[PDB]
C-alpha cells in the first residue's frame, strides 16, 4: 500500500555511488531519472534479477511532488503487462528502479576518467 521505504539491489547500489562520483549529483535525482528512463523502455524489466539488501529510498525524497503520477503510471503499465498492483507493486517498482540505474551505469561506468 504505502510503499514508504524500499531497497535497491546491493550491486546496483555500488553502480549508483559511481554515477554519483561521475556526475556530482544526489542519489535521489540520479535514481528518479533512471526510473523515468526505465518506465519509458518497451521491454518489461526482469522480476527475478534484484535483491533488496542495498540502499534504502523514501518515496517522498525519491519521486518528490510527482509521486502519485509515477505510482499511477507504474500501476497502468503493470495492468497492461499482466501483473497485479495489489500483490506486486513493490517488486515491479523496484524492477524499474534497479533497471534504470543499471542502464545509466552501463554507459557511464565506461568513462572511468569521470
Residue numbers in the entry: 3 to 116
Give excerpts from the publication:
Phosphorothioate (PT) modification, a sequence-specific modification that replaces the nonbridging oxygen atom with sulfur in a DNA phosphodiester through the gene products of dndABCDE or sspABCD, is widely distributed in prokaryotes. While the functions of the multiple enzymes in the PT system have been elucidated, the exact role of DndE in the PT process is still obscure.
In this study, we determined the crystal structure of the DndE protein from the haloalkaliphilic archaea Natronorubrum bangense JCM10635 at a resolution of 2.31 Å. Size-exclusion chromatography was used for DndE aggregation state analysis, which confirmed that DndE formed a monomer consisting of the five α-helices H1 (residues 12 to 25), H2 (residues 29 to 42), H3 (residues 61 to 65), H4 (residues 69 to 83), and H5 (residues 90 to 113); two β-sheets (β1 [residues 7 to 10] and β2 [residues 56 to 60]); and a long flexible linker (residues 43 to 55) between H2 and β2. Unlike the tetrameric conformation of DndE from E. coli B7A, the archaeal DndE from N. bangense JCM10635 forms a monomer. Although the PT modification occurs at 5′-GPSATC-3′/5′-GPSATC-3′ in N. bangense JCM10635 (11), we did not detect sequence-selective nicking at the 5′-GATC-3′ site when the gel-purified DndE-nicked pUC19 DNA was subjected to runoff sequencing. Our results showed that DndE displayed a binding affinity of 48.4 ± 2.3 μM to intact dsDNA and showed a binding affinity of 18.8 ± 2.8 μM to nicked DNA (nDNA), which shares the same DNA sequence as dsDNA but has a nick between dG and dA within the 5′-GATC-3′/5′-GATC-3′ motif. In terms of the archaeal DndE, the preferential binding for nicked DNA is attributed to the R19- and K23-containing positively charged surface.
